Symmetry: C5
Subunit: 221 residues, 5 copies
Amino acid sequence: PRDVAQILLSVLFLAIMIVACLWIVQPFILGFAWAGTVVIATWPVLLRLQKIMFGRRSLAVLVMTLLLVMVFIIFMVHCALMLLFSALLYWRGEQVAQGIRHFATRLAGVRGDAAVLLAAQAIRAVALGVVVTALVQAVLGGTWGTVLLVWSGVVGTLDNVIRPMLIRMGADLPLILILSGVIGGLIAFGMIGLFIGPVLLAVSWRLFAAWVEEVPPPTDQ
Amino acid sequence: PRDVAQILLSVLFLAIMIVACLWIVQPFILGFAWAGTVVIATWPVLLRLQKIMFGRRSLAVLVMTLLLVMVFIIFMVHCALMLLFSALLYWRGEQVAQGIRHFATRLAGVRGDAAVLLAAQAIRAVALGVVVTALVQAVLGGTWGTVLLVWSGVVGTLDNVIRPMLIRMGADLPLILILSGVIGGLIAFGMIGLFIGPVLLAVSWRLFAAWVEEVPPPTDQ
Amino acid sequence: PRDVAQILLSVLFLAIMIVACLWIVQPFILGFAWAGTVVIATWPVLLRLQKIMFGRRSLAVLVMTLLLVMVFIIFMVHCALMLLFSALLYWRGEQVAQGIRHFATRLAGVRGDAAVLLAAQAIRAVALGVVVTALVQAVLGGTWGTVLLVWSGVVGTLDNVIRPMLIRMGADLPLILILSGVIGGLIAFGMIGLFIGPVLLAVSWRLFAAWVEEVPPPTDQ
Amino acid sequence: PRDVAQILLSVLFLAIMIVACLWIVQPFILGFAWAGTVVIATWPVLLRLQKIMFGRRSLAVLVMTLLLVMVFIIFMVHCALMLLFSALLYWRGEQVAQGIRHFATRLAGVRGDAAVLLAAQAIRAVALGVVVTALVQAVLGGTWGTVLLVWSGVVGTLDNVIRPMLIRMGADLPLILILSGVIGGLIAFGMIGLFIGPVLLAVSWRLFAAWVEEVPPPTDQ
Amino acid sequence: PRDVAQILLSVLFLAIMIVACLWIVQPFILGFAWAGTVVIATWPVLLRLQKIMFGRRSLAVLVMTLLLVMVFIIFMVHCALMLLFSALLYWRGEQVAQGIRHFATRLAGVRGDAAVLLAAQAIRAVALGVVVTALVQAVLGGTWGTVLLVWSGVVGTLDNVIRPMLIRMGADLPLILILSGVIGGLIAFGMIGLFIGPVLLAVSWRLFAAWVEEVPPPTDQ
């Protein structure tokens, strides 16, 4: 059996390594979260551009980053790091996705992989909701309530049918979960909890549901 | 055997998930606690209304939420969330009860299920006590001591007999436990510990009693 | 094997239950400690009164609580709770003692039961010391040093012989342990560490001595 | 099975020993880190001097410490400790390296040894980068951006070919990892994170990669 | 298998017992540390006095405590506790040593016993160093640097030979370890780390060396 000294020292060293790595990466962390939230959001667009431009990933990355810049303009400072991370993740998105899924698989066998895929799915859903909210605001031109109203309109009576295979994000995710995640993320984290909240709530809900369903449900008697 | 790295990372990730989920849901937590305390309290009333109105759960939910509003009036701000959660829990009370009991069963085999049922029973008892206190205060019209006096009067000499099958809440719960829970909850949490205190004390007492009774009692010799 | 999720959730829920229960009972905790310290101290007196008054526990409890009041007078506010707890523990002392010993037995097989009995024995010893100190102060009438001097006089040269079977408290307890416990309790907790200090030190010493004696003593060679 | 008391006391005593030892060594810790960062950096230079001066380690240590002084001058206070530690580590570098690698081997079987060797390799890489940055700054004579530009120039288009077997440091280490480590270390620790950041990130990355690769990668299907 | 409840409650109760005992003994702790550091330091002197005065431990304790007083004078307040503890430990030194070694043996089989013996050996070494420092200061009569210079002079060129079997303390202990322990203890704890530092560092070094040597040293290849 392993002695107490080795277990304690391993725990202590792993804790130091994790804390030090987060401390080192902290100046980049928020930028990375944004650049990568966007990347998950717009990955199908990147694939379409890939198909369009002769199957050159470099061209697709260049055009997509230029498009992102043209979305910002029309504050590059403190966002050039975000653009750089977005370009890197567009260039090596498949590798980073494989790494994340493989780490999750190591943590939890198949539940972790499904959790990662669900988190990507939720990010895509929330991003489409935000894009639709911005479009509707522009149309009404001639933000708190607009996102919520758009979310209700998108999935409330329009479950999956109209605009086929395009609102299939919400078909796999709970309405209440996404709504509460968005609101709690905005209140708690702020403009980034808009994506963190739904992701955390959806992933936690799926993990806990899968974990709890292992035992049979209690009998009424 | 599982290595230290996996155990530590699983513990750390679960802790982060739990803390982040509580942080996200925190703006709603108190409202949810109230809306759901009420729902456990008035569930038999909801079932009676269900029976009355042609067995339509939607009609019962609408009427019961309208009744709750007519109890508030005669401050909707910062309480519309409470009303919304109450309506949702009235609509899907059985599903949420099944989920809570099934999670408790996963945590503790049968002790958790009994703990959840006891917590519901204690909430119902305290709610009936509070309703009787308010009624007696209205009659004396022509709050600290009134609740305590009503609690003593309800179960002190009236154990279970008069008003049959109606004060059967206290038949399964300790007097001292409920009284101390009410007082400590009011002092500690405030107007919500009125229900948290009795629930926490009753659940903890049942769990610890069941746990301790596993070994035989110590012999006097 | 139990998974990490269940172990972590059980630990977290038990910690929440314990912390919440202490938070709820906190307004009563000190009063309960006093009312129950006294009860352990005066239990033989209660048994003698029980024998005197026709074997009626209610009469013994009434007379003993009245005697406690006549000791306070000759500040009832913030002490009526103490008197109430004292009366309850006088009424159901055997049940509470059985519960404490049975919980200790569940924690530690036989070491816990012996620890509880030792804690009661130490409380009785310190209480007799305090009573003798007060009596000697009254005689000298015609507090820090008086208790210490009385403790030295009681057991220093008078080990167990004079006043037979009456100073048998100190025959089972270390002098240094009681003295240091009294002093450290007064300095740390204040007028209640007068009983907590000796109890904690005696219980910890017995537990650690029993634990350490399991292995053979190290050889000099 | 080991009882809870022994495990808890062992953990507590080891924690006290570690915390007390760090508390005692704290006045020296930073100096030691520097004197030893330098020693890892300039070890090949020390070996060349060893070969030059008749294979006398004492002569090599003396000359190398004198050279370090001549680098400082052209603030000895609060640095004489650094010079002393540098001289000691130059005198007994192999023994300290063996001790560090052997402790790492005890913690992690072969992963720890590889981690230590990687940390030394990363320190050597960053030190060569810093030396080249200082040289280029002197040439441009006739610091934040200069180090980064030098790092890009050293390995960006010059992977390993020009100046053969001399930029073989970067051949085993990620560009992004070193760059992010340098930046995060400067921002977090300051002029010492210049070496801590790359070391922590490289070691953590290798450990986590080796740990995660144990399970097969998740299948796309 | 033991359930989670018992493990958690045992850990929690042991933590409470340890914390409460340290809290109670805290007013005495520093005095005890000093009175007992001295006792380990002067134990051979006590044995010589024992041999001189007809083998009467009481006489030896009386004379040795009187000698300690004559060292203080030529501030008894806040030191009478120190003198009392010194007298007690002189009276029952063997019993306390047996208890400490037996507790250490229970914690760690043979490594703990060796650690305790090493701690005593280090205390004796540092005490002899301090005595020699004071003597040399008195001779130079006609403190920071004097202790360090005396330490270098005692063992630097005089390893064990001159004054035979009298500087055999340093023959078993590292120079660097003692020096760093003294300096770090003075800086961290203050005039008591003069003994704590060397003890903590020596004990930790021996424990970690013994622990690490269990696995074979890593091969160079």
